[PDB]
Amino acid sequence: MADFDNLFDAAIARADETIRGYMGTSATITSGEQSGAVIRGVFDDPENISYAGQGVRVEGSSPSLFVRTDEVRQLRRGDTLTIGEENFWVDRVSPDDGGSCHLWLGRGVPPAVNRRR
Numbered sequence: 001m002a003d004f005d006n007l008f009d010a011a012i013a014r015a016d017e018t019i020r021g022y023m024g025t026s027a028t029i030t031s032g033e034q035s036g037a038v039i040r041g042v043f044d045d046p047e048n049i050s051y052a053g054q055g056v057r058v059e060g061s062s063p064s065l066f067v068r069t070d071e072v073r074q075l076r077r078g079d080t081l082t083i084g085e086e087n088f089w090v091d092r093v094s095p096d097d098g099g100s101c102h103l104w105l106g107r108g109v110p111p112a113v114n115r116r117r
Contacts, residue, residue, distance in 0.1 A: 019038075020038070021038040021039070021040055022040075023040050023068070023071075024040045024041075024042060024066060024067070024068070025040060025041060025042030025066065025083060025084075026040070026083065027039040027040055027041035027042070027081045027082070027083030027084075028081065028082055028083060029041075029075060029079055029080075029081040029082075029087075030080065030081060030082040030087040030110055031078070031079045031080040031081070031087060031089055031108070033111075034111070039067070039071060039075070039081045039083070040067060040068065040071050041065045041066060041067045041071070041081045041083050041090075042065065042066040042083065042084070043063040043064065043065060043083055043084045043085060043088060043105075044063050044064035044065075044066065044102070045061070045063045046063075061107065062088075062104045062105060062106055062107065063085075063088065063104065063105065064102050064103065064104055064105070065081065065088065065090045065093065065101075065102065065103060065104075065105045066100075066101070066102050067090075067093065067099070067101050067102075068095070068098075068099020068100065068101065069095045069099045069101060070099050071099065072090075072093060072101055077092065078090075080105065080106065080108035081105075082108070082110055086107065086108055086109045086110065087108040087109070087110055088105035088106060088107055088108050089105050089106050089108060090103045090104075090105035090106075091103050091104065091105065091106070
């Protein structure tokens with residue numbers, strides 16, 4: 001006793017990707033005309049509660065970014081990561097042990113559309 005059969009199929013094209021990164025603060029590195037990778041950085045501000053007096057037209061604020069030597073190693077110097085608020089590039093961070101770097105990064109808003117007060 002035996003049997004047999006047949007069939008057909010096709011062929012197309014696709015892509016690939018990866019998803020992994022959970023240690024510190026969730027961030028999305030973005031320093032280019034159009035970029036968005038996985039980064040673990042956190043922005044630290046001196047005092048969310050601050051004002052002027054309807055005097056100055058432009059203010060300045062540069063929070064701190066907490067990342068690991070490795071996490072920051074995969075990137076270059078001047079990479080503005082958008083986390084919590086907006087992509088912010090860090091000047092230079094130098095950890096001491098266990099990937100613990102922190103430096104005041106500069107502001108940076110992506111090309112995305114955001115509502116202003």
